[PDB]
Amino acid sequence: MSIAEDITQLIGRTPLVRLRRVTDGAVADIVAKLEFFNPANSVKDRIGVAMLQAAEQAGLIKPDTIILEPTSGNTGIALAMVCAARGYRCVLTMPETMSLERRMLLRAYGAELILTPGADGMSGAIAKAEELAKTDQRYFVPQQFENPANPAIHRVTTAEEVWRDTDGKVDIVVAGVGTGGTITGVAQVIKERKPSARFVAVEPAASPVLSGGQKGPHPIQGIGAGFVPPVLDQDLVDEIITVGNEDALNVARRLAREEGLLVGISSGAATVAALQVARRPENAGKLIVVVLPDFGERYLSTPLFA
Amino acid sequence: MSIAEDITQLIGRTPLVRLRRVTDGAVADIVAKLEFFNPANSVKDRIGVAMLQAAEQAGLIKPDTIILEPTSGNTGIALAMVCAARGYRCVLTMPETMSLERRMLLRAYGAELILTPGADGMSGAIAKAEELAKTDQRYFVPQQFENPANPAIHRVTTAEEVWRDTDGKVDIVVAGVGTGGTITGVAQVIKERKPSARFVAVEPAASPVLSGGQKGPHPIQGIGAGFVPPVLDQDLVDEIITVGNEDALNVARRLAREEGLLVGISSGAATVAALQVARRPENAGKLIVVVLPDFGERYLSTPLFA
Ligand SMILES: Cc1ncc(COP(=O)(O)O)c(CNC(C)C(=O)O)c1O
Ligand SMILES: Cc1ncc(COP(=O)(O)O)c(CNC(C)C(=O)O)c1O
CATH class of the missing domain: 3.40.50.1100 (Rossmann fold)
Structure with a gap:
């Protein structure tokens, strides 16, 4: 079967x-x-599942956890999708230069999106996530680059x-x-x-x-x-x-x-x-x-x- | 392998x-x-390959053949894709009510598109293809509905x-x-x-x-x-x-x-x-x-x- x-x-x-x-x-x-x-x-999609499975297996996900990730689009879409299936709240930072299809897909999977400045590219998408992380203990940042x-x-x-x-x-x-x-x-x-x-x-x-x-x-x-x-x-x-x-x-x-x-x-x-x-x-x-x-x-x- | x-x-x-x-x-x-x-x-994609393979195996495709198919989008995308790989010329009729993504994908695969009236729906996409077929012997119409x-x-x-x-x-x-x-x-x-x-x-x-x-x-x-x-x-x-x-x-x-x-x-x-x-x-x-x-x-x- x-x-x-x-x-x-x-x-x-x-x-x-x-x-x-x-x-x-x-x-x-x-x-x-x-x-x-x-x-x-x-x-x-491979790392979207993998990074969350790793977190779950290390007991890093709590009932009130909000997943927060810097992305140029695809990891964000992958996490949004895994979060839909799992029932997690998911927020993505992403530069405003990325395809509009990435924005729409994120939302469609019920994820939330924060656009960062295009002149700062991926470095600035990272900063906004790291900056939001320290405002609230509920955030969990997988951090695909690390x-x-x-x-x-x-x-x-x-x-x-x-x-x-x-x-x-x-x-x-x-x-x-x-x-x-x-x-x-x-x-x-x-x-x-x-x-x-x-x-x-x-x-x-x-x-x-x-x-x-x-x-x-x-x-x-x-x-x-x-x-x-x-x-x-x-x-x-x-x-x-x-x-x-x-x-x-x-x-x-x-x-x-x-x-x-x-x-x-x-x-x-x-x-x-x-x-x-x-x-x-x-x-x-x-x-x-x-x-x-x-x-x-x-x-x-x-x-x-x- | x-x-x-x-x-x-x-x-x-x-x-x-x-x-x-x-x-x-x-x-x-x-x-x-x-x-x-x-x-x-x-x-x-299943029928896009299948209908062309059937035609090829029955010797229906000639060097100057133009594939012509009525579609609401997906068969057209499937045929456009098979035609890209094969080297065939491919034309699609499709109602103007279908998603704009279907139009763009058709073109991206190098296929050509003729939009039919939205009030006539799929029946009118069929008619335009059957009508174009008889103007030129080069057309081959798979005709997914038959x-x-x-x-x-x-x-x-x-x-x-x-x-x-x-x-x-x-x-x-x-x-x-x-x-x-x-x-x-x-x-x-x-x-x-x-x-x-x-x-x-x-x-x-x-x-x-x-x-x-x-x-x-x-x-x-x-x-x-x-x-x-x-x-x-x-x-x-x-x-x-x-x-x-x-x-x-x-x-x-x-x-x-x-x-x-x-x-x-x-x-x-x-x-x-x-x-x-x-x-x-x-x-x-x-x-x-x-x-x-x-x-x-x-x-x-x-x-x-x-
Ligand atoms: C379309 C596309 N191509 C190529 C790459 C490079 O893959 P590696 O991370 O395995 O080197 C990415 C990465 N995505 C990222 C980083 C994202 O969507 O945030 C990508 O989305
Ligand atoms: C998105 C979608 N759903 C459902 C169907 C119905 O599939 P059957 O033909 O096997 O019943 C189609 C058919 N497509 C057509 C007809 C097209 O793209 O021209 C379709 O594109």
């Missing part, structure tokens, strides 16, 4: 798909891991899904970095198992903080937070690639139009990088996995579609 | 989830089949998924009817296998054509086409239930807010019906499966969210 008790048992176990047309100049094989096959259509449960769920689920599904043949994993939980969790398991495996972090050209540049405003929602997240393990990352806004957008569009994969802006960015890596002679016949974080329907109000 | 060759190998195999809070007065068990776990987030491949894919996939997943214990299946392919395909397999199984069709109170009333305008997108579709087998349906606009909407909202299931208007409607059926003393301890066709994110512009 395969019936989930609730929506939290429905996270993960996402499919890999081979790219066929969006492969210009590739000498390696590129397969995309499709994270919109999650119950609220993003990779972050929470061990974030990369942990990726070890336990994402990494094993990638390993099993490629039958250990995976050679390189390309992934945009927001909190860096995805790339870190996957590298933690796969790199120990297969020390030849390599891990490429992707970040906006317009905000290249990991590459040692200064932060800046960009449309690549979900990544380029503007600081080095505590949760990322940079010792496991083998290469950083920065992607321009226009490339990220164009490739996002080609995936929809050439592959039938309607994905968000950060998935275009990860694929630009996966393609670049796949053109290197030394990677001929290797297997590359690019993580595609979410669905493009969340972006209709953005310039991805206009 | 579990890697799909393309997006068409990723349809179906959707999860069942038990309803816990939205169960007021229920004496039967209600589990929802979650069709937004499809590659373009709706049940109709196509045998529509209920066939539901026998081969949806029905078996329901049977396997409930381990044959399913007693009643509740499903909104657009083309009626879902309910017909599922009933065709399950009812032969288990003759005690019962099948409830759901339609708008505002357009109760199957109940013997006259057609009318309604917000329950996807169902209540305004005529009896050729593809539906009414001999297999055991009961029709009509659902009011407000109930459909309210329950859609409660599923998001109480279950963490963000689903479209037609899923609210199917659940109103599934709940009504589950309150009947004679159904105490039975297992009811309600089909939840799509995700609520497609509806942000509608009154479901406002």
